[model samples]
Target chain A: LHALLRDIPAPDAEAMARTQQHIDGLLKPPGSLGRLETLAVQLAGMPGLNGTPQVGEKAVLVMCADHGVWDEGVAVSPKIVTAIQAANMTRGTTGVCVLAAQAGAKVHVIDVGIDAEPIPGVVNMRVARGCGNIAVGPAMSRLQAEALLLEVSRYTCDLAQRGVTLFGVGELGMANTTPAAAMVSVFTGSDAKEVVGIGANLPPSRIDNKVDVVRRAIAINQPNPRDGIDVLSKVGGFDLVGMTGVMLGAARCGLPVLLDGFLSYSAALAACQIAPAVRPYLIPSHFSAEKGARIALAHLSMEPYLHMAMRLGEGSGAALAMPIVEAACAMFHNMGELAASNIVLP
Target chain B: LHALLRDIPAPDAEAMARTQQHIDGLLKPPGSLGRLETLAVQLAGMPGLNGTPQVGEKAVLVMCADHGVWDEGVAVSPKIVTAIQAANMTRGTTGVCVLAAQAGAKVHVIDVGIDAEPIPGVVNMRVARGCGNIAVGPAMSRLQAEALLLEVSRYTCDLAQRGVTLFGVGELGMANTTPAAAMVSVFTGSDAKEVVGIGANLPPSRIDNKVDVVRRAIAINQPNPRDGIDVLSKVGGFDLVGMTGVMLGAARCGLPVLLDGFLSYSAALAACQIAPAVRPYLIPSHFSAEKGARIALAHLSMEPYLHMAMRLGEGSGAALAMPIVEAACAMFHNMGELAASNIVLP
Candidate 1:
């Protein structure tokens, strides 16, 4: 864990400056590509990508788990769907997989805290069956929280070492948004009502109850604001902590992390709280349909590349963004320079 | 031209209904992928696509022209750069080509209304040297406008017949936005100030002058609000008319047209006005940095697939959206059905 934090390097300012100058010299008006210009500069500055990035191989790491907060009537999907979908993801037939295939990317599904018996055809790294009921007590022990982070982090590093140039984080868990909202409240210092949303079609009557559960969990846990583990051990889902690990691991390995949606935003905030160095490696991929998305993204000072109102969070949005990121990099390297080109302006 | 308009067909609502039901039966929640879900349904409805559409071959037809609005001081780039970039586009070295290459889409750079002599590599379909200055008088005769549209429309049909499933329209011209704003103002019945924007980095001091130019041109020409030819002849550019042609032809041939930016929006609006049947075939690709984009798009009632703030007009944004649009279609056809799959939820 110490080695992971120590290995994370600052983005290269010189590379970014060089890249911006190169973009300005391209055969179009300065800043005409708008956000794409800045995005290319950011990719150039990434320690893994350097001045010229060619985002070759991409993968989405989907962490599967179940939330003990499921007992709180905060979601509409059955708890068994978590294990069912985790297995489905492994078969190349899910939303993330289908979209990733279009972008020529691979999908890796990991079982971290699923509540069912051990399943085949999944990367098994199960910390336990599921997290504790946050409404009554802590979600997990601090030691367990740390263990989830490191385990997922090491898996991310292994992928990065095996030539995955770009990484995306996704989650699959029943009632995970309940814990996600609680973590967002603690991390952003916002009220429960401000962050609580109808997760996967929770009824109107359950919304207030969900908000109260989040507020009560925070009050009961008294989670440390500055400590990532404290927040994870209290009202966090194993899926969220596992995604947090992927993000931190991505930062450590110098690869960029494309975030999926609202739950991924909570994990991102937690990862940033743990290590501010991880902040630069993050790229938001969606303007999620979730209510708290804008606030969480604004807090991170990151904006998404697409505004498709996507809320399918099995790394679906992240998979879609891979090609766009690749294009941004290609634009920076291959776009013609007006001064250097063969065509004379006059 | 009459045959082209007569051949155009309406979107298949029955196919759309069937596709939506197919999407709902997939493993994920209903309406979870938001815009992507609707995008798939729309694609499924296209007369050429039918249900379970597969967007395989894609190309961007970049229409190159020189706008006589260059005499109005409404832009920063030199008029000669229009010819320069148009020629550069033929060599696969421009912004549109670089990004299009990333999407595995071919680019056909056509010299439709360039002021300069014809080049070697660009597809030639020149209508005139340039438009008559819109600020001082009519852009072209009604016959010339009709000729330009058919020339581009026929070219679009040729490509559509040769297996280009998706088509994107782009422009290369100085001060093209001047005419774009004029067309938007006339088409949407909005004021010039409400539609004028800084075209390719116009100075703040010159923006008001550009607005007055549009307003004065509209007054002088008194273009028929309901006639597409009158609008093109009175106040539009060769490039805008050419793109308008591509969109209309795509509609007739049942191919999807991905729009690039503000100029493309103006062209799209004109295409829709000419044949409201063309409206369903259009797909917006950018949230352009041009200030009038949102207003014009709102008037058209279409939303872009991306929010990249891309204002570089040569089909760059459209090229970036190809993979994402392909992903949407893939999600519709390929994603697994939860109920039919091997894993049972309980």
Candidate 2:
């Protein structure tokens, strides 16, 4: 079933070397454009971008769902906010929409498992109304978990086929961070308390409750660390599963993925574990303020470009970084070269 | 006389409070926008901004000069590159020009001092042909240092009057990092070896030579740390003095200044020391690749927005950060409010 996952060839190394050489020959000092140079080179290495990259057209894929874990009081936001924000994103009134519009990117909000009636304007591929609470049982059946990964992978490929060259992944679900905490703990072997954070702003006492809930979810689920589906099915939310698919799909189709905050980190870990080749295709957007963000990103061997301390997960950080990526492409394309014939180093 | 520097009023506290309250009412979680929210509040607090800030119509002032330290083998690039780059900057071919153009900010290359003939397009404010080699003698007359500050202040205000509200300060000069490192060591109380970096990609031996020159420049000149002019005269170049003027001028004009890298930090320190009021008007653009940048910025009590490890000090970092600042203004201006009557926090 995972045909594209089999080979997942590494990005063209010769193209990356050529990209770096081109960067060095630019009028500026060698290696001076910094991470932007690195970004351009990474983009060049992608299979889709033969050598030169096109970062102009961008899209943010926001996967919206509801979490059964909201029953445990793990989040401050009401569960209905998932549907409300899902609709808001499509109307261009949400945080991600405004920021994305400013960066000349489009926001695509998807309904994977919202408990409410079908939201108008949201891309619907609902697996269920909501998943089972992981604190006591699994988030969803292993079959349903696999179904999300497959379905969203196809959806992501469809978007890529339609000229969305760059992808940003995010999740919208109340109490989603609880499963994010649990899954990161499962993947990194960190204790649940070490990965738990105040989701959507929680009081000290509520944060304590959240930590205990994460521990129980991991302990009861006892997911297999070696299997991405097992861990995601046991503790991850529908939104997370869908985003993992987004990451996998973007990479398999040879496109770059920009990641939002904490939950995106967890979803990225799942996708990376499933297909290690997906690692280089990802660009982390910001240093999330959530406590576990540092550890999760470290485990992924990636560092974010922006340090805004933002925790708004509607792929806002990715959108905020869109202009910067565009600037990187501009540096690669527009900068005049200082030829060796005219310029010589001391 | 710096009449504008006297009794500079702080940003209105009531206005700042109102800005934060407005941000709190934003539809997303409180404090979730991170540094973007902080940036918006800081812009609101600026005296010219009153309560609402205008970050549009940005301009980067690239102050170009010549450093006689080039005679000491303190640099790898030829001294003539300064004039060449200054002219290229005017024609929109330099690194700063391309990046600034991409950010929708204009690049204004100003000649404070240069060894060659007057450029056709650069803003002419030449104080001298070139500065004295600081490793062997005072860089300029103490009186000349003061003139650079005074003249550049008027020039900055003139630009501000022309609808250029946001300012980015940078410099273009060969062998200038020697002076930058020397001034940073004096201000931060750090040793020369601890502060010197490989400017323009130097061999380890060249870096060692540069550090010894910086140490000697400080030891022989004995620059006064308390007086901004004394330091600029004994160990600083015309570009540094001009940038100090730009910063002070921006603050006095009730405008905000975005600072570019290590030299910018040194100039900011000089400006703040001269008019303790200038500190609030400054916004750091990036953590420079220069070694002493961290220590220098730490002493200034500021943090940068970007972390690209960029070593090009032509206001490129500031230009790159321009979009993030624009996004901040967008957040403040466009975010819809959630009424307390309709929504209540847990």
Candidate 3:
């Protein structure tokens, strides 16, 4: 399975050289476009050839689901907010959705086991009604977890087949950070407190209770990649499985992936472990102030674009940053090279 | 008259404290927000308010005209691009306009003077059709310059009366930086070479020609506050004068004024010199790599939010940063105080 995750052939060198020439010809200095210069190089490396990168057509695969941990009241907002925002997402008028519209990207809200059966046309995909509440027990059984993974894999492959090149991955779930922290600590060996944050303002006792529940889950589940499938079966949400599938799909389809905030980083870490080549496809959007996100990006060696202190779980940060990506692609394609411009040196 | 310019009021302390408290309650730490925090504090001091400072509403006043110096072919894009964007601006799909929409801000694309007539819907507050090309001679007459200042004062006062509180000042002109740099050289006693950029990548010979043009304009204008209206009439854009008026208007209206890139800074410096109280109203958006802009901010002791390498004039960089300002305001409005949130300490 890991071997099957190979990237497509490298982008064409001659075309890349020509593109670089074009960039150099831009009236400014040879490489003054800064970060945008590197972005052009990355785009050149994709699709095995340097070509003009266009951002007009894009898709953000947003996986929405409810975490069973919210049963412990680990969130400031109720779990219903998840379903509500997920539905609002379809209208493309909500915060992240509006930003996505402004960014000229499409959003596909997937209800991969959100608590309620999503209304028709509300979400593009639904793996199941919802995953089991993890506070009282395991999130999903081994068979169900595998099925969720397969379902997400199919969704990603389907989008890839439909010609999506650059992909942004996002997630929505109330109290999901509890499981996210548990998984991050178990996998990365970080302290629970470091990875855990108040998902919403919770009473101190409830915050402690949420921490205790995460600690117990870690203790009881004892997640180990050495046990791989078994660990996911006990604690993973359907959204995590779907996000992992999207990562694989982006890599398989020769596309680039932009990771949105903390929650996506957790799912991405798991996916990269399963198929290491998936790492190259991922671009971190921002370094979320959340502990798990910082730690995850550190391990992944991805640089984020902005550093505004934001811990909101919705993909608003990532959506907001799409313009930078657009700017990068624009600079890469627009900056002309020395040969093309016949740049005279003093 | 020049001596009278220095009697502007100092920053308000109680208002600053109230604003600081509001910002402290924001979701992040007391000062983790960096320049954004500083912006809020400075805004409080400038607006002289203890309660939540309201921007009233957002409006970007872009003063547009042409510099005769463009006759030397000292710019990359033609002068027409300025008029094109100005017209496109009224359509409300341009970057600054779209950003204004996203933030619920309005835009006033004003024509102080252009070589050509502005479109019908464009706001015409003409100081002159265009200034004399600085390459061959001084850009404007001393009388014209003073009239420009009065025009800016009048425009800003009108905006204030219209109940426009939150204001950002932008500019549009080809080779206008020549005037901005010349103004900087006078104000800061800096060398022309150090203050001048490529001026949109003009040919080296033309760059030299442009710098010479600016140097001559400075020599002819010999801007000195002691000369008062004489200096103002000698050298300045119709828009610069109007922007100064807007800055004064912002100060007098008790509204906050966000200063956009370099050219605006030059105009703002003049505004502050004219009425020092206006300094309290200005929130600089960034430190442009432009020498004049850097010097202007230093003179004022102000800080900018982001330093992403951008030199794309047209207020794009400043306009792009609107989200950061929104984040600052949102943080100030939405965050819970440490006491209220009950964040546990070790």
Task: Locate the minimum summed-lDDT window of 10 residues in model 3 chain A.
Answer: A334-343
What's the lDDT for candidate 1? 0.87
TM-score of 3: 0.63
Q: Report the lDDT tens digits of candidate 2 across residue range B1-346.
A: 5576785667777777888998889879899898899888888888777577567478999999998888999888888788888877877767888889898999888999998999999899998888999989999998898877889988888887888879998899988888999988988789998999998887787787888899889989999999888998899999999999999888887888999999899898888888888888899888899888889999999988788889989898889888888888888887676662255565
All candidates in order of lDDT, best leading: 1, 2, 3
Q: For chain B alone, what TM-score does every candidate structure achieve against the true structure?
A: 0.97, 0.97, 0.86
Report, to 2 decimal places, the DockQ of model 2. 0.69
Which should have the higher DockQ, number 2 or number 3? Answer: 2
DockQ winner:
2
- Candidate 3, which segments miss by more than 4 Å at Cα? A1-4, A7-17, A48-50, A91-93, A122-147, A160-165, A186-188, A203-206, A225-235, A286-293, A306-310, A328-346, B1-147, B152-307, B312-314, B319-346
Residues A1-346, candidate 3, lDDT per residue (tens digit)?
3333554344456656766776656544444444555666566656622255555457887888877677676776656667766766665544456556656678888887777865667554565666666656677887776666666666665776666666778887767777777767766778777778655545466667777887888777767754445555566687777777777776766567778777787787787777776666677776676756778777777767666555664565666677666666644544333333343433
Residue runs of model 1 more than 4 Å from their true location after superposition: A342-346, B342-346
* TM-score, structure 2 vs. true: 0.98
- Please give the lDDT score at residue A6 for candidate 3: 55
Q: Report, in order, each candidate's fnat.
A: 0.81, 0.74, 0.04
Report DockQ per prediction, comma-separated. Answer: 0.64, 0.69, 0.09
Query: Per-residue CA lDDT of candidate 1, range A83-201, in tens?
Result: 88888887888999999898889999999889999889899989889989999999999988888889989899888778898998999998988899999889898888888877676
Per-residue lDDT for A27 in model 3? Answer: 41
